[PDB]
Design a binder for this molecule. Sequence first.
Ligand SMILES: CCCCCCCCCCCCCCCCCC(=O)OC[C@H](COP(=O)([O-])OCC(O)COP(=O)([O-])OC[C@@H](COC(=O)CCCCCCCCCCCCCCCCC)OC(=O)CCCCCCCCCCCCCCCCC)OC(=O)CCCCCCCCCCCCCCCCC
Ligand SMILES: CCCCCCCCCCCCCCCCCC(=O)OC[C@H](COP(=O)([O-])OCC(O)COP(=O)([O-])OC[C@@H](COC(=O)CCCCCCCCCCCCCCCCC)OC(=O)CCCCCCCCCCCCCCCCC)OC(=O)CCCCCCCCCCCCCCCCC
Ligand SMILES: CCCCCCCCCCCCCCCCCC(=O)OC[C@H](COP(=O)([O-])OCC(O)COP(=O)([O-])OC[C@@H](COC(=O)CCCCCCCCCCCCCCCCC)OC(=O)CCCCCCCCCCCCCCCCC)OC(=O)CCCCCCCCCCCCCCCCC
Ligand SMILES: CCCCCCCCCCCCCCCCCC(=O)OC[C@H](COP(=O)([O-])OCC(O)COP(=O)([O-])OC[C@@H](COC(=O)CCCCCCCCCCCCCCCCC)OC(=O)CCCCCCCCCCCCCCCCC)OC(=O)CCCCCCCCCCCCCCCCC
Ligand SMILES: CCCCCCCCCCCCCCCCCC(=O)OC[C@H](COP(=O)([O-])OCC[N+](C)(C)C)OC(=O)CCCCCCCCCCCCCCCCC
Ligand SMILES: CCCCCCCCCCCCCCCCCC(=O)OC[C@H](COP(=O)([O-])OCC[N+](C)(C)C)OC(=O)CCCCCCCCCCCCCCCCC
Ligand SMILES: CCCCCCCC/C=C/CCCCCCCC(=O)OC[C@H](COP(=O)(O)OCCN)OC(=O)CCCCCCC/C=C/CCCCCCCC
Ligand SMILES: CCCCCCCCCCCCO[C@@H]1O[C@H](CO)[C@@H](O[C@H]2O[C@H](CO)[C@@H](O)[C@H](O)[C@H]2O)[C@H](O)[C@H]1O
Ligand SMILES: CCCCCCCCCCCCO[C@@H]1O[C@H](CO)[C@@H](O[C@H]2O[C@H](CO)[C@@H](O)[C@H](O)[C@H]2O)[C@H](O)[C@H]1O
Lengths: 74, 253, 87, 107, 37, 45, 58, 90, 32
Amino acid sequence: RFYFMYMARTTFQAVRPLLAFSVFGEVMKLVLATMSSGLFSFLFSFVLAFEVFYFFLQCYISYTFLTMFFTVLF
Amino acid sequence: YATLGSGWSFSKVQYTKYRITKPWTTDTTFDDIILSQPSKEDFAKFTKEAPLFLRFLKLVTDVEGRQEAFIQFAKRCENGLTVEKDVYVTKKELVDCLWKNGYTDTEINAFEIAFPADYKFHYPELAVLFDLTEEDCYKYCIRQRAATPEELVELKYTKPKNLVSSYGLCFLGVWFGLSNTVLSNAWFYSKTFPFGAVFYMLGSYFYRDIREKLWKEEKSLIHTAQENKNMGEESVYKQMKKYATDTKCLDYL
Amino acid sequence: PSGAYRLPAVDYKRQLSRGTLVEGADFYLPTAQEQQRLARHFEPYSEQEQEERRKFRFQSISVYLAVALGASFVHDYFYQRRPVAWC
Amino acid sequence: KTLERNVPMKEILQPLWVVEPPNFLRQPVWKQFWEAQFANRSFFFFGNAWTSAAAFAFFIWWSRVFDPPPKERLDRYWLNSPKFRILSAFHNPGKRPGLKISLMTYE
Amino acid sequence: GKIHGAVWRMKHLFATNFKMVGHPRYAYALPKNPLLQ
Amino acid sequence: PLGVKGRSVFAGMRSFIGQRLGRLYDSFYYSQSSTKYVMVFLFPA
Amino acid sequence: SACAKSVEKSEELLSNGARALWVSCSNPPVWKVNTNEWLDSDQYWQAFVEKHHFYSQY
Amino acid sequence: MLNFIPKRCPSVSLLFGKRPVQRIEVGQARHQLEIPVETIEKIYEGVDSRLEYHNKDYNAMKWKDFMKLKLDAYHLLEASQSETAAKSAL
Amino acid sequence: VSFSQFFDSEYFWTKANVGPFFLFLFTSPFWY
Ligand SMILES: CCCCCCCCCCCCCCCCCC(=O)OC[C@H](COP(=O)([O-])OCC(O)COP(=O)([O-])OC[C@@H](COC(=O)CCCCCCCCCCCCCCCCC)OC(=O)CCCCCCCCCCCCCCCCC)OC(=O)CCCCCCCCCCCCCCCCC
Ligand SMILES: CCCCCCCCCCCCCCCCCC(=O)OC[C@H](COP(=O)([O-])OCC(O)COP(=O)([O-])OC[C@@H](COC(=O)CCCCCCCCCCCCCCCCC)OC(=O)CCCCCCCCCCCCCCCCC)OC(=O)CCCCCCCCCCCCCCCCC
Ligand SMILES: CCCCCCCCCCCCCCCCCC(=O)OC[C@H](COP(=O)([O-])OCC(O)COP(=O)([O-])OC[C@@H](COC(=O)CCCCCCCCCCCCCCCCC)OC(=O)CCCCCCCCCCCCCCCCC)OC(=O)CCCCCCCCCCCCCCCCC
Ligand SMILES: CCCCCCCCCCCCCCCCCC(=O)OC[C@H](COP(=O)([O-])OCC(O)COP(=O)([O-])OC[C@@H](COC(=O)CCCCCCCCCCCCCCCCC)OC(=O)CCCCCCCCCCCCCCCCC)OC(=O)CCCCCCCCCCCCCCCCC
Ligand SMILES: CCCCCCCCCCCCCCCCCC(=O)OC[C@H](COP(=O)([O-])OCC[N+](C)(C)C)OC(=O)CCCCCCCCCCCCCCCCC
Ligand SMILES: CCCCCCCCCCCCCCCCCC(=O)OC[C@H](COP(=O)([O-])OCC[N+](C)(C)C)OC(=O)CCCCCCCCCCCCCCCCC
Ligand SMILES: CCCCCCCC/C=C/CCCCCCCC(=O)OC[C@H](COP(=O)(O)OCCN)OC(=O)CCCCCCC/C=C/CCCCCCCC
Ligand SMILES: CCCCCCCCCCCCO[C@@H]1O[C@H](CO)[C@@H](O[C@H]2O[C@H](CO)[C@@H](O)[C@H](O)[C@H]2O)[C@H](O)[C@H]1O
Ligand SMILES: CCCCCCCCCCCCO[C@@H]1O[C@H](CO)[C@@H](O[C@H]2O[C@H](CO)[C@@H](O)[C@H](O)[C@H]2O)[C@H](O)[C@H]1O
């Protein structure tokens, strides 16, 4: 069972950035497709920037957990 | 290209939003020597006043015992010396060379009292003054100018080239590159502009912190190297000075 | 068992008690010519060896390109062929 | 004498070689790879060295998993593939290969 | 890149010392100084 | 000094196989009875 | 004779020291110098790099 | 010190042997030191011309001679650092 | 060269060229 647990954890930590980049991207794309005015767009630019920062945070977390999971003593 | 120069000063530059400006000229243009890779004919020419140099040359030639050279050079140079403009060696560099190569204090003081501080010696002057070849003097001047490449050099102005073909190719470029929805894409607005703008803002806001954090190690290494060099040289010098008086044993014996 | 085919080693604890354990050199140097380089101080590399070494001051992007093109050609047109419809 | 030759700048300033990177080891790549085999923890694809990555790549290439499928298995993935469809359309310029693809599946 | 950084530091920290003709762990192999006594 | 005169590479192979088999028998003898029989006969079989 | 020989070898020592000082003062700044050129000039530190980075990978 | 010997050609080192003496500045205080040009030229007998660095203005010495020079420097330096050093090089 | 004196250890590891032999050994599956 430990092998299954480990592979699950590894795959989750590996796909975390892909999710942050793809599904939240689809949400942003829905919003872009639906919005027309200028005030809402001005306010949504900051959401896009926050998504940038969140993607970088997820990438850092994944890097940390992956260097923990792929570190061998011998 | 190699980084020429005898200086240990770790120097970095910060840029402005203004371009370098030089006095207007209808025939010349200023450019970087390493980026242009100019030739002797690409260099611009001008006329320089002789007398101040011809007097010193007559003196040196009367001392050395070669007056045919002075006569020939004076007959060549009358009405001014026509020479490439930005191929020269400064008085300070020349004095350093003389001193490190063993010219006497009398000759060095003669140079100093004869020429102003901002005088610029060109390769024909150097050749006729040291009995060398103008080719070698030209190469030396070029190396000494490349050692200080922040100063632009003056070349002959040339009209642009291949403007018609360049126009055709640029039209083709726009015709194939703007006939698309790239600059209006959801990908653009979601990734390209946000990521790029965030990188640009962070770089503009931490422009100096980043540079300093990167250059810390190099500065420390350069400091360490210079300190080691100095201490070793000083120790060796003082020890040889201590042992300098070990030759008189023979003449005493 | 007789003992001829015994394990050719002693446990690290017993070695440590004997005062025999060594820990280092994840790598090794096979030849004495290579072992005594840092000790010679005057001829770390023979003249012939120096002349041979001077041929690898840079990596050969030309050889890289040639080998990569050859391998790509082989891999694509001998090992990775797939059918295509014809009308 | 006077100077008349047009002296190029390449006779004076020599540019450094930066196109292909330096080899501080002064040893070829295959010799590096061979040396790594006898070093501890770098044998073939064990370890996390570059040689280990290279050997793992060669191992998966030498395996069968990345080879093309047989004719008995083409219609599992390949005949419904975007690459296959685009290539068929491209190499049959003004035609429609749907019918020929159906017949290839039948075959 | 690791090798490049290592050599780049070795340059600055060794090439101008006058005390590191080689590595200290191999100083036993150097000739003896005629000035010491 | 690689190889010896009068000896054959096939004899060397035979000697190496003998060494391997003897080492395997020694390692199987000096092992836990709870694990070795299972892991060596029942799971493989 | 022996005094002359001792003076000769001491002068050789001091001349080598002066040559070393001249070489040092005429050398370019080591941070301006190219790294691979320095390593090509130096043959001892080549062996130091090969030992720890060619015979090992970690 | 580095194994970079300047080429004595005038296109590189203008006025090398025009006079019988060389001069150098030493240390942070920049003490002056004069050296005979023959003592200097002794180096260009070990200089190797196959090797040229730093815009092809510096050759390299043979490692034997360069390391002998470094060893003399190191001996002088360690003698300076020590206190039981000999009062003479005889 | 004879079979025995070729497969002798000394001649096989010092003077012989085992290149073709080991190439045939590696490619055995192809020939089979
Ligand atoms: C398989 C199926 C497909 C097959 C078909 C393929 C079709 C290919 C078509 C051919 C064109 C190929 C593409 C290149 C185009 C040229 C681009 C170019 O050079 O321009 C830069 C050219 C250079 O200027 P620059 O780059 O700014 O500065 C450089 C200096 O000019 C300095 O320049 P320079 O010193 O290097 O040269 C100067 C030259 C520049 O003049 C030119 O523009 C060159 C044009 C030459 C075209 C030759 C085509 C050859 C292939 C077709 C064969 C036709 C048979 C004729 C054979 C040649 C013998 C007569 O002439 C002059 O400027 C005036 C002085 C005249 C001196 C004598 C010149 C003739 C030399 C003798 C012939 C040499 C033949 C070489 C052998 C070729 C072997 C393959 O300036 C121009 O742009 C010229 C104007 C552009 C031409 C088009 C004018 C508008 C007309 C448009 C056509 C109508 C619209 C289309 C509708 C058509 C409906 C039917
Ligand atoms: C038909 C019979 C059977 C087939 C055999 C066909 C013929 C081969 C026969 C056997 C070999 C030749 C035998 C006669 C040699 C006689 C001449 C001689 O003695 O010396 C050789 C002769 C002269 O030697 P030399 O006198 O010492 O002087 C050499 C020069 O100074 C230059 O020295 P250097 O230090 O400057 O080295 C230059 C190096 C420069 O250094 C480098 O290698 C840096 C670049 C490395 C790239 C990453 C390496 C990945 C390696 C994967 C390898 C497996 C891939 C799977 C294979 C299929 C690939 C499609 O460039 C290379 O030559 C290596 C190229 C490696 C192949 C490129 C693979 C593609 C890389 C893709 C990377 C990009 C990925 C993103 C793609 C997306 C693009 C949009 O030159 C050579 O032939 C070099 C041999 C090249 C062998 C590959 C390098 C070793 C890499 C080991 C990888 C693991 C392989 C595991 C082996 C199998 C397991 C045991
Ligand atoms: C039907 C019922 C089946 C049930 C089983 C029945 C019985 C059948 C026999 C047993 C079969 C299972 C074998 C298990 C052995 C390994 C696992 C184990 O538990 O061993 C522990 C057992 C006890 O070890 P220990 O108590 O922990 O410590 C003592 C040391 O082992 C003591 O070490 P040492 O000081 O005595 O000597 C050092 C030792 C080192 O052994 C070890 O300590 C670890 C060995 C590493 C194992 C995994 C390596 C995988 C490497 C990846 C390969 C990549 C190749 C890439 C090539 C690229 C080039 C293109 O040397 C070796 O023996 C290894 C040599 C083979 C390694 C080959 C790797 C490539 C290098 C090539 C070298 C040149 C060829 C050899 C030439 C020799 C002169 C003729 O190990 C041994 O007794 C010796 C190691 C095993 C050697 C192989 C023995 C023959 C196996 C024959 C297998 C064929 C089966 C097919 C049968 C037919 C079916 C149809
Ligand atoms: C033990 C510790 C760890 C040691 C690690 C050592 C590291 C080196 C390992 C060697 C590297 C290769 C290993 C790859 C993984 C193995 C599986 C594999 O890849 O192949 C799968 C492949 C089957 O996969 P598949 O899913 O069925 O796919 C079928 C396709 O047709 C697929 O076939 P295909 O149509 O695509 O054609 C290619 C296929 C087809 O290949 C064949 O056709 C097989 C038949 C070829 C016969 C050629 C004539 C040979 C004449 C005999 C030579 C003397 C052999 C002496 C014994 C072997 C010595 C190593 O072969 C290959 O794909 C390449 C494999 C052959 C590469 C050469 C490797 C030779 C082994 C070198 C080992 C050296 C070091 C060993 C370590 C020593 C320990 C100290 O293997 C086979 O086809 C059968 C293997 C041969 C077994 C026959 C013998 C069975 C034993 C009972 C026989 C009864 C008499 C014996 C009684 C015993 C006396 C007491
Ligand atoms: C075929 C595909 C192989 C590709 C992957 C493997 C790597 C490719 C390189 C070849 C692999 C084999 C390298 C063997 C190196 C050992 C050489 C050596 O001298 O070892 C010491 C032995 C023992 O020597 P010795 O002890 O008798 O006498 C010499 C003593 N000393 C060493 C002290 C001087 O020498 C040999 O006899 C040669 C052995 C190698 C030949 C056999 C190859 C082994 C691989 C097959 C394993 C199965 C064996 C049973 C085969 C039965 C055949 C019917
Ligand atoms: C591309 C492929 C690359 C991958 C490499 C592929 C090839 C190499 C793969 C090897 C990896 C797997 C190796 C695992 C080996 C584990 C097996 C094992 O060790 O057994 C468990 C036992 C377990 O012993 P243990 O239980 O005492 O201790 C094990 C470890 N602890 C202490 C933590 C529990 O191991 C042995 O003791 C014996 C091992 C050697 C014998 C191997 C089997 C052959 C035996 C034949 C002799 C039969 C004699 C019969 C005589 C009867 C009368 C007495
Ligand atoms: C984010 C986590 C991602 C982790 C995913 C990493 C997957 C690693 C697992 C792959 C290695 C597994 C070892 C399998 C060995 C099986 C036993 C064995 O020896 O069989 C040999 C057998 C060869 O036999 P034949 O095909 O018959 O040879 C014929 C020769 N012509 O080996 C194989 O089949 C090769 C197996 C290929 C594995 C699949 C490749 C997957 C690609 C992975 C690379 C992509 C990057 C992966 C992320 C890196 C994670 C560290
Ligand atoms: C310039 C000369 C250089 C020398 C290069 C020599 C290399 C020769 C090695 C060729 C080995 C090719 O090995 C072969 O690859 C092809 C793929 O293309 C495979 O081809 C397989 O898939 C294709 C496509 O589905 C089908 O035609 C069929 O199912 C089958 O042939 C073979 O199953 C395999 O046996
Ligand atoms: C640098 C030193 C190198 C020393 C080692 C030299 C290696 C020599 C062996 C490599 C030569 C090619 O090796 C051989 O290639 C062919 C084609 O891939 C393979 O052949 C295999 O695929 C082909 C094509 O499907 C089939 O026809 C064949 O039935 C099958 O066995 C062999 O299984 C392999 O043994």
